[PDB]
Amino acid sequence: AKSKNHTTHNQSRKWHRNGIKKPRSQRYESLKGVDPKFLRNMRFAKKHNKKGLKKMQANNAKAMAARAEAIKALVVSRKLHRLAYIAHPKLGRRARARIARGLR
Amino acid sequence: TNTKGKRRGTRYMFSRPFRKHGVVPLATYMRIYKKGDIVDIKGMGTVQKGMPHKCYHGKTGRVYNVTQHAVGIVVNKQVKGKILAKRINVRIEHIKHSKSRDSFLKRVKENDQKKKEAKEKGTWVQLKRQPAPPREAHFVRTNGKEPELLEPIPYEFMA
Amino acid sequence: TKASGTLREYKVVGRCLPTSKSPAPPLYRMRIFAPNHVVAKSRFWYFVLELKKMKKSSGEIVYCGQVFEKSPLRVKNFGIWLRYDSRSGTHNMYHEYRDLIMASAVTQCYRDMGARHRARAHSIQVMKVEEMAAARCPRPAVKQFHDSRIRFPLPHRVLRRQHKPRFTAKRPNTFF
Amino acid sequence: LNKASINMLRIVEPYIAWGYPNLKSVNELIYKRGYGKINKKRIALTDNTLIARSLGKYNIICMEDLIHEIYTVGKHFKEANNFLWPFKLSSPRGGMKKKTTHFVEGGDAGNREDQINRLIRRMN
RNA sequence: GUCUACGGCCAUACCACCCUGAACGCGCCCGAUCUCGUCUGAUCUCGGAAGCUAAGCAGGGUCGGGCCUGGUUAGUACUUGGAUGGGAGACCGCCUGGGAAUACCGGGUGCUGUAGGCU
RNA sequence: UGUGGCGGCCAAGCGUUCAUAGCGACGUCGCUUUUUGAUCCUUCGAUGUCGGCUCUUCCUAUCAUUGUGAAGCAGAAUUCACCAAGCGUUGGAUUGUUCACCCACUAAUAGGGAACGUGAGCUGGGUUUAGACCGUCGUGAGACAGGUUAGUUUUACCCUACU
RNA sequence: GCUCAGGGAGGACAGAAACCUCCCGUGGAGCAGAAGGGCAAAAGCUCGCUUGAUCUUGAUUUUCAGUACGAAUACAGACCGU
RNA sequence: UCAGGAUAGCUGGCGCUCUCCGCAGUUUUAUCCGGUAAAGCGAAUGAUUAGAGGUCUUGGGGCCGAAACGAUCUCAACCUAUUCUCAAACUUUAAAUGGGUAAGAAGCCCGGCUCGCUGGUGUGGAGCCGGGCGUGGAAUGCGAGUGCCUAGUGGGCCACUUUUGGUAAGCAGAACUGGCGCUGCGGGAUGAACCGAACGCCGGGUUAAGGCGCCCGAUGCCGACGCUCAUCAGACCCCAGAAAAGGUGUUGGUUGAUAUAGACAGCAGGAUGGUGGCCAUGGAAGUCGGAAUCCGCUAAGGAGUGUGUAACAACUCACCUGCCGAAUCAACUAGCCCUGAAAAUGGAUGGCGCUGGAGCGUCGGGCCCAUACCCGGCCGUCGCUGGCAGUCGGCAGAGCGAGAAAGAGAGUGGCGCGGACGCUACGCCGCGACGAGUAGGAGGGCCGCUGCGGUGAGCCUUGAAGCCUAGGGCGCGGGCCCGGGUGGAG
RNA sequence: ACACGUGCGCGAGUCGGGGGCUACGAAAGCCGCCGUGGCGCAAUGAAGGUGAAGGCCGGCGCCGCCGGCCGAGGUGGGAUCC
């Protein structure tokens, strides 16, 4: 007995039922498959960050003077206009009281 | 069943164009690929070392690794069900800077200049892109002339 | 198209949206005998795409108003030029009808082409519709009514409204 | 209508019968078949305190504001159109001409420019 | 106006023949002691500066060939979608969008980077 | 529907003359399921599978008979075509044969279908179990789309059909 | 360092075909093999020197389940060639 | 290994992390990618007909050579400009549909540190700190994300378009999307796949696709305009039986002729002579033929229509009329009808029947009905991580749906003895959308059977189980409860 | 026997299941100097084996260390909380 050899008939329908989910993209991708001369050097640069720590925070505290230096030195109808003003209930808390007294 | 194999159905794909054979221009090697810039892949026949598989010819990925002669691309390849973002090592003759990002970065810089200028004045600049809106009313002037009448031509058996 | 009911003559003028190369593109006019404006403007783009290299998206419809009959109480002769598709090749015809309106004569033409030649609305193109004098007509079916002292009876007046009794005593009369 | 929506309309062309509505039709549809999408629930717009409580931020505080923002395609058309639950119209009273084919070739599919208002009467 | 050295795009720069090339250049040119290499100082390497634009090179010319670039061909061929459309079929027509390619007819015939001269 | 059968269309030629009385090359359009393929849809907890005898009915693609048109129809004989299936279409030698071929007769000895009609109707010559013989092949058991001989043919009393 | 296939024309015996010399020559040749692609101061031909056809981790591509084998691509650490 | 498994895919269940910025079987704007359809051969590779103009690089042939030069008509070969026709395994050009990527804070623009990498050079690259910038940077739609365990399945078939092998197949094998399988419903008379449209239990309305002589709901409209007669009429997707060819049938058209300079016919009078010119020359007195084809004479004389035909004396064929009086002729084209058209039981536009259609083509108005669409009733599921512990009562004050984030706020200064229901919270209540289903999966059973621990101060000789029943009812159902009879101990 | 979900008890633990003690009951109760033991709290290597965090501040722009103070990372997103 012979049989059908191959098809891809119901497969488009099958793929889309649970939907085609794109790869889980993030910030901070892994450094696997990066040049291991470049990678070992990048690891030494990370290891030797605390050696130049005193200049980092000292420059940041001198540059934080540069903020305080300059931040203190820094310092359609006329009727529908009126009725949209009167009707809304913090701007027009006294215009309604004037209206309310104006029945007498 | 088809014959498997790496260059099967790459006859016109990895060919060089008509009167564009021979020596490879050197600017190709002098363009500077950073880690991140978005790059479109196109295999070349002239250079047989470090080709992309025909799966990738015409796909755009991003660079995650630059070694002496080649760059690492991350290209979204589709299988049956799922899409795989996958990491290939392709020589820089088979590689170009995509101009898809050179239209966005001009937008951002112009978009930001239009907020450096006109933030203090109160004049509000519309930044976002509108699709071509329905056309405005206007007066089609018949400058003296009465429009020519077009009446369909009678049939004549040509050849 | 589909020649539903009595057609109406439309004056559909159109032009290409001005680009940079020409800010003043020339206006073109057409006579469309069609059921309404929405089909008149589609049949305008059919004929305009075939004569000129002008399209719907590459142009605008400047004016599409119904052309009225200037004498719908006078009996006129209408000589119409055709272009229809047979089941082997395409043919040009000249066809005379006798009516008060042009749009009536064009509906009368579509019925006659449908009846005699089995030619439908999508097949038939109309290129020229001219009202004629009584002396400039070559067809005997329309000329025979060019008789100032015309006289004929209504011979065999078949009884209509047959189902009004449905059960009568008498046989119906035919001679009137 | 923009550039984006017309090229979306012409690829579902044989399944829709669309056109340019009248002020009357816009009044009839939003007064007779007006339901809001309040808490994702299809609730009938019997009062103005539904529209005001939902679309208060865009200054659409009544039914006449809603009908104005729809008809004269304003700023907050998106948030007023997406507020309106899609209109559950009746069958056409008098029947169709022909469902399957285009309006131009006798049928009742594709763009019916000013003639959509007649179909709105028979289904509303 | 223009060359030289190194170039980028790689015929609007290529090919055929003709004409003109001021001044520095570039050359042809002159030799074989040392360097160096051949059957042969022709080529290659070297040491020269009497001559010459004849050639290379440059600029230009030709109802030139090619190349580039428009028009036409033509809303033609094909094509997305639609119909209880036509037809015995083979294939067609319409609606809704997209739209080429020869022959044939015009126009053009290198742009330019750094560095250094000549006028 | 390739193939088998049967029929048109065109007119190069045949026919003393003369395309078409009767025929018809090179081409070309069909029809039929009385041929053989091609396929695997139905049946493998079974549809009894070759022929003949017997007996009914149907088809027409008409052999004969009836009525007719046309011939290269003088008569006689013969050939082509039309309406046309009412009635006929036989007796034998050889073969299991279907088919074939011959003798004789005759108005004529036309072609077909009905689960390649018809086995609880027969028959059992042929195929196609088990016994044996020969030839070719196999080392052998055995094989043969070779020849040969001998080899169990069951049941109706049910429903319908018909009498 | 050269330039191929083929052609034109000349040159003792020498002719269709031995050898020399000039001109045209975009690949019409060659690259071991089938076919496709690719290549001209080369990937071809001829010379000189050699052993990267050597030792060693991981990554990746192709078939793909996104597994093995086979084959391959870019790196890194050595020792070497030119 | 091919009647089976493992393996991804499709399926279900359990949840969990979040939300009162993320995604997408789509489009728009940018930006790459391609070598099919088409086209091309006076562009490469290959196949391919045709004359030209040149000529030897060629041969021949004969032409006046004693022998060779020239030579001369040259023919194929050759070169050059042209020409007709092609390609799944050719191509300069080259679409439509299509396939990637981008459309921001995972971002920008500033400083400052680290490096054993890289270097003329705080040069190049990467990593690290502290900063400041929201107008959230296309349209439209929508709550997303993530992890466990997992059953069935692994014979498929059909259709529009594309498409391979075969003459073709209700044949064999593919791509794309849609169906049947797993699915009823209205139409196609009938039918797994067509067309319309997908279904909880009902009433009203209205539609689709199809219909409306009678069967058979609805044209019993004073429907419109033509076409067609069939001794085989014709009559609706898939679809259920036809072609070439043809018609002085009939209805349109197209092109070109003759028309009062008087047509298709109707019937005459005539068809003459050099000439028994010609070609081989049995024969061309015109007569298997072939080729020359004019004139002397004119209304016709044509070397011509058939002739016994070698011709012949001789009948007969275009011609102008003798009689006679305006509109005809000729070739294509395409509608309907007709010929072409032959099978076996009796026979099928579904039947009857229909011809001022009940046929065919083009179109009005009205009407008929689906489980589809609208309004409403009832059931269920799902969603609202919905509402209620305020039944806050002579110690009471009964309010919290309302467009706009917040206190029905609190102190010190300037007579009558009253008030429904509620809340098995595992309950009760409110609003919105939904409901096909085989294999398969899960939940809920106040569905049922038989036995054990508890419990009903259960039932029962004033009659238990069991059984029968035109009795009374409940439940969507599984089932159940009462009445009457029989029966005799649970 | 295994895996995963789910309910309960105790929790760096947990469990007497084999043993012993003093009608229903062959049940239930108890042991702790009855936890032997099982599974868990440590991995990796074939193996012999080895076996899970540090900077700074002085003395000996550096010590193998003498010492001294403090000490289970960082970035981004993150229900609630302040």
Return d(Cα A77, Cα A61) in angstroms, integer. Answer: 55
Shortest alpha-carbon distance between residue D104 and chain C (Å) = 5
Shortest alpha-carbon distance between residue B132 and chain D (Å) = 5
Chain B residues within an 8 Å CB radius of A33: 64-65, 72, 87
Q: Which residues of B22-51 are buried (b: 16+ CB within 10 A; e: fewer)?
A: eeeeeeeeeeebeeeebbbbebbeeeeebb
Neighbours of C171 (CB within 10 A): 7
Phi then psi for D67, rounded to 5 degrees?
A: -65, -35
> Helix A65-74 and helix A54-63: axis angle, to 10°?
10
Spatial contact of C143 and C77, defined as CB atoms under 8 Å apart: no
Spatial contact of C85 and C119, defined as CB atoms under 8 Å apart: yes
CA angle centred on A78, ends A77 and A80, rounded to 5°: 60
Chain A residues within an 8 Å CB radius of B81: 14-15, 20
Please name the residues in contact with D74: beta carbons below 8 A apart, sequence gap of 6 or more. D68, D80
Please name the residues in contact with A14: beta carbons below 8 A apart, sequence gap of 6 or more. B81
CB contact under 8 A, B133 and D4: no
Method for structure elucidation: cryo-EM
Q: Which two tokens stand for residue B159?
A: 């050849």
Distinct helix (H) and strand (E) counts, chain D: 6, 4
Phi then psi for A61, rounded to 5 degrees?
A: -85, -25
Cα-Cα end-to-end distance for chain C? 44
Q: Of C121, C100, C96, nearest to C111 (Cα)?
A: C121
Shortest alpha-carbon distance between residue C27 and chain B (Å) = 5
Please name the residues in contact with A25: beta carbons below 8 A apart, sequence gap of 6 or more. B85
Task: Provide the 8-state DSSP code for B18.
Answer: T
B36/A contact by beta carbon, under 8 A: no
Whole-angstrom CA distances from D83 to D23, D42, D66 are 19, 10, 10
Return d(Cα C69, Cα C7) in angstroms, integer. Answer: 13
Which resolution in angstroms does this entry have?
A: 3.2
Return d(Cα D16, Cα D110) in angstroms, integer. Answer: 6
Q: Of B46, B141, B129, nearest to B93 (Cα)?
A: B46
3-state helix vs strand vs coil in chain D, percent to 5? 35, 10, 55
Q: Of C139, C144, C146, C145, nearest to C96 (Cα)?
A: C139
CA angle centred on C103, ends C107 and B155, rounded to 5°: 70
* Strand H positions closer than 7 A to protein CB: 2-3, 8-11, 20, 23-36, 91-93, 98-104, 106-109, 111-118, 125-135, 137-143, 145-146, 155-158, 172-179, 195-197, 205-209, 220-227, 251-254, 333-336, 356, 360-369, 372-375, 383-384, 401-406, 431-433
Spatial contact of C113 and C82, defined as CB atoms under 8 Å apart: yes
B24 touches strand H (CB under 7 A): no
Cβ pairs A/B, distance under 8 A: 29
Distinct helix (H) and strand (E) counts, chain A: 6, 0
C125/B contact by beta carbon, under 8 A: yes
Please name the residues in contact with B101: beta carbons below 8 A apart, sequence gap of 6 or more. B37, B38
A27 touches strand I (CB under 7 A): yes
Phi then psi for C34, rounded to 5 degrees?
A: -150, 150
Chain B 61-100 residues in 7 Å CB range of strand G: 67-70, 72, 77, 79-80, 84, 86-91
Return d(Cα C98, Cα D97) in angstroms, integer. Answer: 31
Return d(Cα D69, Cα D75) in angstroms, integer. Answer: 8
Handedness of CA D30, D35, D39, D40 (dihedral sign): negative
CA angle centred on D75, ends D70 and D80, rounded to 5°: 45
